[PDB]
Design a protein around this ligand. Structure first.
Ligand SMILES: Nc1ncnc2c1ncn2[C@@H]1O[C@H](COP(=O)(O)OS(=O)(=O)O)[C@@H](OP(=O)(O)O)[C@H]1O
Ligand SMILES: O=[N+]([O-])c1ccc(OS(=O)(=O)O)cc1
Length: 289
């Protein structure tokens, strides 16, 4: 049973057993200078930005972006599950320009990305919304250990005892890294508020100037309501064994502020107190609504 196993520490970070088992393949991953790395803590907007990038790369052509599922168009690099997927191999076999997905904390990112000075788009999302999204994701995405109850999971998340480790360290270290490498550090909440502005930021970062009509096309097709229904983007093409959308759909709510629906007031206060301690010595700033 490849699913529901305990995570395995990889250089200090809990990862899926099969990622840990194939860690050398990941560590030695060969990046390319024109790779665009989409780097996120899980549930932070990876798919949204991946779709955007793929739409950009295909000039807003919806059909072209339906050539395959997002997880094939934008491979999850470190995700290696025997018999199921190998992000490294999928990427190795992908023509440039590659869009590369990762959730690795910065200290675990394969050094080739640094050596190739790749452009990286990091997406951060407020921790409270992340943990809620992650909770449901843990439930539906069977490669994860059992999340436990929301309460248990919340505690694991705060303790960083979740797949890919602590969100806090993830976002903070990636934020710090933006001083060393070309990281367009985006916030899920900003994409919610003004996706056009954020996509323009992506375009600028990518050094692409496209017609307003194409930008509007990209905006339309990267909206949650379009993506949710889009089988090439919404993970419903996943084997049910890997992702059971009947448990929780991948495209779950796609809002900011869902944490309000999940957190008890006590859990929220506790979370915030803990959060402040973990975050106050970082200049990184978020919105939760
Ligand atoms: N287009 C668009 N607009 C708004 N929100 C979107 C979009 N696409 C994905 N989502 C929401 O992002 C959450 C999934 O995050 P990721 O794509 O990072 O998940 S993953 O780590 O790649 O598995 C998950 O968030 P929650 O809905 O809060 O669970 C998705 O619904
Ligand atoms: O390609 N896959 O098989 C795949 C891709 C993503 C994915 O997400 S995960 O967090 O459940 O590993 C799971 C399986």
């Amino acid at each position: 049973d490849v699913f529901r196993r305990e995570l395995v520490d990889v250089e200090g970070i809990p990862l899926f057993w099969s990622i840990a088992e194939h860690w050398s393949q990941v560590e030695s991953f060969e990046a390319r200078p024109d790779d665009i790395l989409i780097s996120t803590y899980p549930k932070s907007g990876t798919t949204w930005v991946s779709e955007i990038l793929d739409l950009i790369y295909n000039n807003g052509d919806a059909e072209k972006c339906k050539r395959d599922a997002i997880y094939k168009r934008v491979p999850f690099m470190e995700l290696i599950i025997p018999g199921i997927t190998n992000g490294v191999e999928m990427l190795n076999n992908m023509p440039s320009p590659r869009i590369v997905k990762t959730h690795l904390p910065v200290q675990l990112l394969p050094s080739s990305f640094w050596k190739n000075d790749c452009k990286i788009i990091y997406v951060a999302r407020n921790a409270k919304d992340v943990v809620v999204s992650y909770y449901y994701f843990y439930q539906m995405a069977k490669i994860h250990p059992e999340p436990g109850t929301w309460e248990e999971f919340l505690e694991k998340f705060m303790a960083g005892q979740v797949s890919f480790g602590p969100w806090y360290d993830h976002v903070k270290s990636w934020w710090e890294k933006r001083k060393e490498y070309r990281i367009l550090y985006l916030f899920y909440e900003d994409m919610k508020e003004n996706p056009k502005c954020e996509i323009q930021k992506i375009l600028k970062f990518l050094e692409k100037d496209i017609p307003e009509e194409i930008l509007n096309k990209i905006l339309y097709h990267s909206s949650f309501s379009v993506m949710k229904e889009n089988p090439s983007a919404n993970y419903t093409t996943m084997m049910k064994e890997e992702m059971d959308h009947s448990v929780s759909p991948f495209m779950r709510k796609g809002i900011s502020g869902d944490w309000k629906n999940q957190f008890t007031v006590a859990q929220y206060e506790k979370f915030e107190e803990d959060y402040v301690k973990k975050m106050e010595d970082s200049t990184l700033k978020f919105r939760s609504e």
